[PDB]
Amino acid sequence: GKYNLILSEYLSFIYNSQSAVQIPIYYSSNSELENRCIEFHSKCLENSKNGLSLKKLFVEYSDVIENATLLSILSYSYDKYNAVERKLVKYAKGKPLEADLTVNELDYENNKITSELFPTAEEYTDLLMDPAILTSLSSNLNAVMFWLEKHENDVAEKLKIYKRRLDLFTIVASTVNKYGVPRHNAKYRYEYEVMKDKPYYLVTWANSSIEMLMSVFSHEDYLIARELIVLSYSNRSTLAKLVSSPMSILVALVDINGTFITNEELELEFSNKYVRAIVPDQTFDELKQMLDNMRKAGLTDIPKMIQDWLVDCSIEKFPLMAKIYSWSFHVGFRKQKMLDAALDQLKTEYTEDVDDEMYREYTMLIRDEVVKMLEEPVKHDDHLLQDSELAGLLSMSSASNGESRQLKFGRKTIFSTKKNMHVMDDMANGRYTPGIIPPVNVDKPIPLGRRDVPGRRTRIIFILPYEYFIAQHAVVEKMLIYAKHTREYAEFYSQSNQLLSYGDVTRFLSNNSMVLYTDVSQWDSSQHNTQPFRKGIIMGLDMLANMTNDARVIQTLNLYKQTQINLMDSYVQIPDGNVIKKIQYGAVASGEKQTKAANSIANLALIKTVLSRISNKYSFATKIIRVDGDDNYAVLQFNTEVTKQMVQDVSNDVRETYARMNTKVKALVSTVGIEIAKRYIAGGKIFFRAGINLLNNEKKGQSTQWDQAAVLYSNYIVNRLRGFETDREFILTKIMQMTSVAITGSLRLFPSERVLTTNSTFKVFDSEDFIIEYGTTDDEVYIQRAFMSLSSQKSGIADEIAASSTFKNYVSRLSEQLLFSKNNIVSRGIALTEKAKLNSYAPISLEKRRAQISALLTMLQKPVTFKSSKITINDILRDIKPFFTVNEAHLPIQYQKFMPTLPDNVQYIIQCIGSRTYQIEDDGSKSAISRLISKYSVYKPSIEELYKVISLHENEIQLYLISLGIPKIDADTYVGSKIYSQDKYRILESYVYNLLSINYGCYQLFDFNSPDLEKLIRIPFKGKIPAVTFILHLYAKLEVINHAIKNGSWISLFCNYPKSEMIKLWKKMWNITSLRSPYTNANFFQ
């Protein structure tokens, strides 16, 4: 309940001119008070129009400002020019930074003046520096300066925080003021004209530095931030890698004194096992070399901190190491040229001097894995393999982006990259030939996208024609079905939907065991991803062809084999100025349907071969092998306790055996912990890097500034949970900057706290960190209803596309492939489903989003005169709130701390009620209807759509299922079985869990079925209304958990809900009309 005050103070700060006026708008559910609100708003508008002060009106309508709820603030300012520089000159007292132009290997990566890199405006490109975020550097400077003004007169540790941040911002502000604040355009891009005489990386460096300095609280924070901010001005390439390198060894220096053990996808059983860390001298030499590299780059504080920690190598002081690791990733992205990044990726030294025996065994293992994955569906004539083309057509929405093509629908021309629209266009023009896989050779080389992650090297992505996806979809789906129940495939293994996000490596860690872990992210152009890998897959397909008598399955396998054959001899396109390089590339890359599963298969085969060779010199049992995306790790158990020499010998043997196959591996062997891309374990504890950048983005998103503010808050929450706390006031300042909309060049509307924190499509953040927003008061229900009224919007582009003959022809072909002939009713439902699937196209979704935002803005400019009987979640909670009695309770701490970087209050919740055991899926995946849908298409209807559908008539449900692509017989079986009667409860559970973010943020870490938690909830059971009991119990759990989060203490809840109230609420529980913005989903794991 602080956002509105901070907003008003920020408006005063940024519009300190004497002509600046803030007009606060209010709303109320009470008609008597709403009339006063309307009169107050009218009088404020009239006074501003006549230019009269509004102070007296705050006395005339002091009840409105008291009893009504603030809806927004209208700001009128007329002196906006050169305001940020006027504020900044105060903080530019320090010495500006001078870039070292001999730090980066590539010339254009040195932070020199833009003219020195792009002599003419035609040569200029901001792609190598673009923050790719819809917020300006001027806004970041304004937010930092507002924070400094607000906290200028703090005392105690607050004053120390202010002083540290003032020093860091003095650095940043002096550097920026030396050249002047560059001005963004409407697209938040920085043009050549405003960047000629500035350092090229000034804007992105300034954004990263502002984030870092606003993330500083302690002295160690200040030292790390100062070092990184000063060094990243000159270093743009190797700084993050330099700082993150030691961690891969540090995890191996901490003994385990008790640890966690994964059971099923989030369930941990805890061990009191003690394991000593066995570290050979070579590892210490490597760590010494890493620290020497740090110092050679100008680092003094970070290596000194690491050396100080190395005195004891204790897990209690390891949080500083985790802090350095997380901070390393906030020096921004490395958006080097596609040519250099690709050439780094496809830098290969292929040799004929490889071990033929090893390669033949590896190929045989790949063949065996493919056969194991696809034997049963191939032998039994699985429907998906019989209708592979139809399955691919139905699942096109889940395909990767193609290369942009000029499509025409009706009389409109578009430039979609969506493969479904490409299929539509080709069908309309007689170019749809699934049976032919286009070559990807020097005649039609593959265009390349890029995936960039801070610290990590850039990855190339194939952009293939849609025929590859059509050919590969069904086979890869069968592969994923197999891999979901295979524990070795960490990326895919899951009992229902959730992955082993904590990993499974600590179960077999012992004093007779060692864990070998290897980074394999650089094995895209390795010699083992060449002909051997593709030919192993081809041999598997050839074997599978003999196991089936269905011509359609054989044709599916033939098309998959043809895709592999074509990809064996493939070329890639890379632009370079005015010349396109066609580079031979017969290796693996993402952007193909099978890439993830195929990489897992190949890595498993390769590690099996390597371990087979390593068994020559040592006797051990391989306990587990896990291939988790960019990393692999295997646990080897020995008949003796592990010694230093054993660890060193195993590491050397693994490296040499991988080299025998021409694979360059840095084989890291430990006894106590590992470090992989998505987590690292040290001292029996698990850590996740908190490197999500806030003021910089990898690439320009297809969202709005509103949704980007929501994503900014979500990223801030995820970073905070992982141990990287940015000041919440700075985040709220950014939120108010990004959610404001210009009614005119002089008038700007700032939404209030209620607007932004309310559960709706417009939700951006929560008033309290880690607590889902809900409220039982009349105003909150009223505004939720009003916002729900604005959710439904149309798209003109979607309408024109759906009305075009191209879309109608596509729907007709889809229907005839679905065994319907001029049905006239089924076809219309299929057309609706395909029009919905068109929502993945960025212009359509953006048009809908902007329509919603515009409607919201029109509503916000006036007091909300909207009333409806529509039921929202706040209505349910208001109904059930009065019957809950609250008492003070106590829970002892009886659960282990396994995530040391969790915030203290979240950690308290975990210690008191425990961590999540098993997760109820948020999409209703384990409902009969959802399983039926997944049987034919990977398209996932939103849980809201399923919630609406499951309460319709039987024929309506049947028609919806047929539209999704389920055959009529199966849909009629589902409906006539009356299975929807049981399915509606699972659907309601998933719907409510989605609305209340039970599977997001900190809630995903909690156990909502904890015996300790349910010991605090006392709801006498009344049967035969499961929906009401479910919502009552979930609400009680949320209330208790949120109270503990906010206060750090516990409350018991008691609700003797009357039966009549239960029956009344039962009717409403199936008519809930509520939404929550997906942009507010804070996924702790990513």
């Binding site: 020097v442 370079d576 005015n578 010349v579 396109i580 390089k581 066609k582 580079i583 031979q584």
Partner: peptide
């Protein structure tokens, strides 16, 4: 648009 072929 001139092309360069790297084999």
């Amino acid at each position: 648009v001139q092309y360069e072929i790297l084999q």
